[PDB]
Amino acid sequence: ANSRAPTSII
Amino acid sequence: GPIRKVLLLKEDHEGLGISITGGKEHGVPILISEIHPGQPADRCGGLHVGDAILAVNGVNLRDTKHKEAVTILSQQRGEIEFEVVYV
């Protein structure tokens, strides 16, 4: 994976 | 693991009840990082933290950027079919 990717609540 | 097809039933006043991370620009799939208790993804029973979302309602998400995936996922209503895989 990639900890640098953002996270969105959807 | 095996690719699975999972049905989710969402009411119009609700979101999906997941958090997603990842995206093509980050070299990783759209991944479910959270499932909110009691919300539609939890209720459907077939989605899990760690699942990659390969497609939703026949729309491929394998090559989508993060925000593209957000727009596509949030547009879906009602009876929503997911194609997912746990790696």
* Strand ranges, E, within B10-57: 18-23, 28-35, 51-56
Q: Which helix (H) or strand (E) holds B42?
A: helix B40-44
For B7, what's the count of Cα atoms within 13 Å in the CB-facing half-sphere?
3
Please indicate if any CB of chain A lies within 8 Å of the CB of B35: no
Joined tokens for residue A5: 């990717």
DSSP-based three-state secondary structure for A1: coil
| Contacts of range B27-34, beta carbons closer than 8 Å, 24 or more positions apart | B27/A2, B28/A1, B28/A2, B28/A5, B29/B53, B29/B54, B29/B61, B29/B62, B30/B61, B30/B64, B30/B66, B30/B69, B31/A1, B32/B84, B33/A7, B34/A9
Listed in sequence order, the residues at least 6 apart from B73 whose beta carbon sits closer than 8 Å to its beta carbon are A10, B16, B20, B53, B56, B61
In Å, how far is B54's CA from the nearest CA of chain A?
Answer: 15
In Å, how far is B28's CA from the nearest CA of chain A?
Answer: 6
Domains of chain B, by residue range, sit at 1-87
Can you say whether residue A2 is alpha, beta or left, with left for phi > 0 and alpha for psi between -120 and 50 degrees?
beta
CB distance B26–A2 less than 8 Å? yes
Joined tokens for residue B83: 């194609």
Which of B19, B23, B26 lies nearest to residue A9, judging by beta carbons? B19
**Per CATH, which fold does B1-87 belong to?**
Pdz3 Domain (2.30.42)
Chain position carrying tokens 């390969």 = B54
Q: What angle do CA B63, B60, A5 make, to 5 degrees?
A: 40
CB distance B66–A9 less than 8 Å? no
- Burial class (CB within 10 angstroms; exposed 0-12, middle 13-18, buried 19+) of B39: middle
> Distance (Å, rounded) from C-alpha B66 to C-alpha B16?
16
